[PDB]
Write a protein that binds this ligand. Structure first.
Ligand SMILES: Nc1ncnc2c1ncn2[C@@H]1O[C@H](COP(=O)(O)OP(=O)(O)O)[C@@H](O)[C@H]1O
Ligand SMILES: Nc1ncnc2c1ncn2[C@@H]1O[C@H](COP(=O)(O)OP(=O)(O)O)[C@@H](O)[C@H]1O
Ligand code: VO4
Ligand code: VO4
Ligand SMILES: [Mg+2]
Ligand SMILES: [Mg+2]
Lengths: 711, 602
């Protein structure tokens, strides 16, 4: 009704489904439906004011960042409106996918805005990180491949077309946003993408012949430009990810091998925890990204191994210098969006001061990869000179506070400030205005070098990951792997990376040889004898070899690995309609349909969850199909000793057995892999060690004698 | 009594241990209150006691039978854990369920050494160490809560959980109370009977009460802020709105004639004097912060009204400053008047939350066809036309209700059935129905008679923590050991398969012995799901054990599952047919059937 209410309503019409922090006075406020939703999510009191009461809720302007964090975590998008001239407009829209602020973001985790589009011929997925600037395009052609991409990327906000047919993988995701179908058109996407990259055609990127992916990227770029309400100079490339480029891992294999998250859900006791001691946050995020998507390009891996070897001697000197550089990638993003704070520019100055030390240390070491990283990082002599002169040694958190500009950067600014300290209100007001204007000019001077600075941030992060891997290799005794043309895995004195560090008792290393001649190894062993660790050590060694890192073994020769499949454990989803056998069988079906000669298949106790005869029969058929028709390199762990006779019937299958010694009705585990087979599982002994009551174990032993006597 | 005891004190709390010479019963406790430790010392009434030389409070054990003192080195945790592990022949004590009690284990280590010294005859008769708890709440382990999906699903998501089905509470305080009730289900019949009477009584008027309850909002946070005197001006206005709402709720509840409903009405209160103070002292729409001013309303203070007049038609600016200072002092004075009644207000916020949870439960019951459960003295569960609360809501197809009867006469049922038959859903439906009955809610069944349940044990998952040092069979055997050691006649033990990790003969042997022990000695109410059809021959050999078979019909390649519980053994599980439905390639299914024919033929 009132003119003020009419203005809020016009802006609300422009942004209907998002909470609007309309700025009245010094307090941001929400009205009508937004006020009720905000009060429940932000825990702020709701007070109704008559114009027809209008529900109104409010937060102080000083505390806005703390409140924005609560809504961003809940996945709500909050548009912030400020009075520019009272004339007002939405200055920025804060959404879980595109947050570049330090408080809203997490230091060692990346927030990715992603787009899913389903055309009749397969799916197209595009992911953009606003802070790093990385734009990646993909064309998954199966529901299973699309689900793996969503789980691996873990998109903070996913933009799906209204007509998306398979709203099952999408449903339950965080920050789902329905977007109109018009936004996904290919011709509109091509024109917008070409303008941002400044290229007439996308042939140089190599994304020109992918139609579905380009449609998703056009929606993602348009939403990102609208959400930030400014041109995004940080985004300058659209690389395309292909299945051939990286080893494929399904969502289950990633969780079973504990690459970044343990089976319970914590980050403790994970391969990333053992390998990640990186000094800078950029390094931690980059190492996690490499472990999730290993590279199958030999040239990229060989350069990474050569850098690790060259810097291994000088790691102790480089790590303290790298720690000072800090998270340059995030700081450059704020500079690109022109939203940086004085402290961020001081951190940028500190990193530039460290660059001369890093360049000198890298110059002494002689290797083609290390010299290329040294050339890319650069010196930035001009920028460090400007930052040191323009900004004070310890600047305030916010520009409005004042004191951001050091004396002597501008004679006029110093004179106005001196007059006020020595009309005083006029001089203070003029000084605050001039200091703000000079700060904007500093962004303009730093921005033309953004292309070089972004290249330097990637080089420094790469050096941090490679130096960390080199330091880890020296401390944990890892050695470099070598690559072979035909599919095979040969490991000497291999040890599981995580178990070796966590277990106080000495790890007993084991050898593995898998070749086209010996495609499958059936591991039969005493319970608690180490079979699962032996199988998982092979996958973790193979993943570590293909991320360019040194492997935890005396020597490893690894041939091409297209995909790694792990069937481990059993789980029930009663609400989804999936029984424990159904969940296991769909995973087994995925291995049988999608496996290739290059792929490595690790299967643990397949055929359990059903009667013994049905389980053994399905296990024999699945083993015969994998060894005879798929011809994949596979490791099968089984307590069904009937399957031990497969090698005699079929060539290309061998039996390996872990062994344990039984003493005085107690079990001692050698944990050593010896060729042959084991006919005893020692189940009652493991149960007694677990704490099953002695009376129960004695009756069980009596029953076992009776059952064995019957046959 | 023949009881040797030990006591310990530290910054974390107090630890205690008990050993009975006659029965070889070794138990530990960690009572964290001095008064609780004093009550425990009297309840145990130990023949002999051992305490730390530097125990801080000797008054708890100042006068005791044969009181003795032993050195600190005997009480050290690392030495104690190794000795206890060696005495029981176990790698870890996680299976006994006492691994996570540091103080309790430390006292137990001193008692074990002393017991060996006093008699070596009792030492071979000590085989277990269990915690002692007669807590009113039904005991549920962390694994049981996640397996039953009481509040959090196995993936970690909020959806597809029992709390999601029942959590439609209007106010945020109500949602917290329901989640707290689900985690601790009260076992005392009197409190539950009062809650059930309220749910039935307020069933007719749920639509009238819920809109008024929604207006009250969350008062727990506002009252906590008032206690720290950090309450915002708007938060005090929110309290005033709830005071205005309370007369309406009381009038609606006055027509109802149930003793529990009337008690809840009295606890809510009217707070007319507090409402009068807030209405007179605070403006209708107060500012977010008290610093700006305008929070106090004219007429609360005569001096402020006069200063406000002078402020608004440089000396005038000084008068404006005086007005802001007078207003802030009045605001602090307002907290002082409200705080004496803060204990009374806290009782009222709890009463309003209980009304919201019970009105919500009543609405859920009418919408979802739930019925009241009748408590019985002896330990038994009887369910007629029972349904699973979560599965029925998320399943588009109809749910097939299955009957359950468990008594001391028929304590154990071996459920055997086809894969995807519904055996696990049937076992869980019993657990969620028992928990729903014990929180005072209406159970999802036509009729339920639930007897006392001490603890609910669920052994379903099979996972390995390699870094921890336990394989999948050790993790499963650790859970089975906790079931056998900590089970009681009252406990409800649901076991989804055992021996799924070891070879068929070792697994069947452990399953036969664990099943015999639970029926013959523990005498717990057990539901056992199994694919070993050898165990279906256990019911004739052992009393209290019966067979329940789920039904399926096979036509050609596909299978249809009845989801109906009938008495019998099944004897066939259609694993290959379920694999074909899962999508295993036809050639793999064809080879599997050929091998199956050869295995059975020989
Ligand atoms: N070679 C080894 N040296 C030392 N410890 C080992 C070795 N192999 C396995 N272990 C230990 O065995 C446990 C895991 O055994 P696992 O392979 O899961 O057994 P299973 O699958 O037979 O039950 C962990 O304690 C792990 O540290
Ligand atoms: N009585 C029933 N009526 C209808 N559907 C049922 C019934 N019991 C189970 N289901 C469905 O079957 C699924 C599998 O049941 P479940 O007990 O897990 O079988 P099992 O564990 O024997 O494989 C459930 O998640 C549900 O979708
Ligand atoms: O994975 V095992 O503990 O059953 O040998
Ligand atoms: O899906 V089952 O738990 O009947 O093997
Ligand atoms: Mg294993
Ligand atoms: Mg089951």
């Amino acid at each position: 009704h009132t003119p003020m209410m009419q203005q809020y309503l016009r802006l609300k019409a422009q942004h209907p489904e998002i909470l609007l922090f309309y700025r009245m006075g010094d307090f941001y406020e929400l009205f009508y439906d937004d006020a009720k939703r905000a009060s429940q999510l932000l825990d702020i009191s709701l007070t109704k004011r008559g114009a027809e009461p209008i529900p109104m809720a409010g937060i102080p302007y000083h505390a806005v960042e703390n409140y924005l964090a609560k809504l961003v975590n809940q996945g709500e998008s909050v548009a912030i409106c400020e009075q520019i001239g009272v004339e007002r407009k939405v200055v920025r829209i804060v959404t879980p996918g595109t947050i570049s602020d330090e408080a809203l973001l997490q230091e060692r985790q990346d927030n990715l805005l992603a787009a899913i589009w389903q055309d009749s011929k397969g799916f197209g997925y595009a992911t953009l990180d606003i802070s790093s600037g990385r734009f990646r395009l993909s064309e998954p052609a199966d529901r299973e491949t699309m689900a793996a991409e969503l789980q691996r990327t873990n998109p903070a906000e996913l933009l799906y077309a209204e007509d998306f047919a398979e709203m099952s993988l999408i449903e339950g995701r965080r920050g789902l946003r329905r977007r109109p179908l018009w936004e996904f058109e290919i011709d509109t996407a091509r024109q917008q993408l070409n303008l941002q990259f400044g290229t007439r055609d996308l042939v140089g990127f190599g994304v020109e012949n992918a139609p579905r992916g380009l449609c998703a990227a056009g929606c993602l770029l348009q939403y990102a430009k609208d959400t930030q309400r400014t041109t995004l100079p940080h985004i300058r490339s659209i690389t395309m990810e292909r299945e051939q480029d990286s080893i494929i891992m399904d969502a289950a294999t990633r969780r079973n091998l504990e690459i970044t998250q343990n089976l319970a859900g914590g980050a403790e006791n994970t391969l990333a925890s053992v390998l990640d001691c990186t000094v800078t946050p950029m390094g931690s995020r980059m190492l996690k990204r490499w472990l999730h998507m290993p590279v199958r390009d030999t040239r990229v891996l060989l350069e990474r191994q050569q850098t690790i070897g060259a810097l291994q001697d000088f790691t102790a000197g480089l790590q303290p210098v790298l720690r000072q550089v800090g998270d340059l990638e995030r700081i450059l993003a704020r500079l690109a969006l022109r939203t940086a704070r004085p402290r961020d520019l001081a951190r940028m100055r500190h990193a530039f001061q460290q660059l001369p030390e890093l360049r000198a240390q890298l110059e002494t070491v002689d290797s083609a990869p290390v010299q290329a990283l040294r050339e890319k990082m650069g010196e930035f002599a001009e920028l460090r000179d400007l930052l040191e002169r323009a900004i004070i040694d310890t600047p305030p958190v916010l520009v409005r506070d004042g004191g951001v500009i050091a004396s002597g950067y501008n004679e006029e600014l110093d004179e106005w400030r001196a007059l006020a300290d020595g009309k005083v209100l006029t001089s203070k007001g003029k000084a605050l205005a001039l200091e703000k204007q000079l700060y904007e000019e500093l962004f303009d001077l730093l921005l033309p070098h953004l292309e070089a600075l972004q290249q330097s941030a990637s080089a420094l992060a790469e050096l941090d990951v490679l130096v960390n891997l080199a330091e880890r290799a020296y401390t944990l005794n890892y050695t470099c792997p070598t690559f072979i043309d035909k599919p095979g895995i040969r490991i000497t004195e291999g040890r599981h990376p995580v178990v070796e560090q966590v277990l106080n008792e000495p790890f007993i290393a084991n050898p593995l040889n898998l070749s086209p001649q010996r495609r499958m190894l059936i591991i039969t062993g005493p319970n608690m004898g180490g079979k699962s660790t032996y199988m998982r050590q092979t996958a973790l060694i193979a993943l570590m070899a293909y991320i360019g890192s040194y492997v935890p073994a005396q020597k490893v020769e690894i041939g091409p690995i297209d995909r790694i499949f792990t069937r481990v454990g059993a789980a029930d989803d009663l609400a989804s309609g999936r029984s424990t056998f159904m969940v296991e069988m769909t995973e087994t079906a995925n291995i049988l349909h999608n496996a290739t000669e290059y792929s490595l298949v690790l299967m643990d106790e397949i055929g359990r969850g059903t009667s013994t005869y049905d389980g053994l029969s399905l296990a024999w058929a699945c083993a015969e199909n994998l060894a005879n028709k798929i011809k994949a390199l596979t490791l099968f762990a089984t307590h069904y000793f009937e399957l031990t006779q497969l090698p005699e019937k079929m060539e290309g299958v061998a039996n390996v057995h872990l062994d344990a010694l039984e003493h005085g009705d107690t079990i001692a585990f050698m944990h050593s892999v010896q060729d042959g087979a084991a006919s005893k599982s020692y189940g009652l002994a493991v149960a007694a060690l677990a704490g099953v009551p002695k009376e129960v174990i004695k009756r069980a032993r009596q029953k076992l004698r009776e059952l064995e006597s019957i046959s």
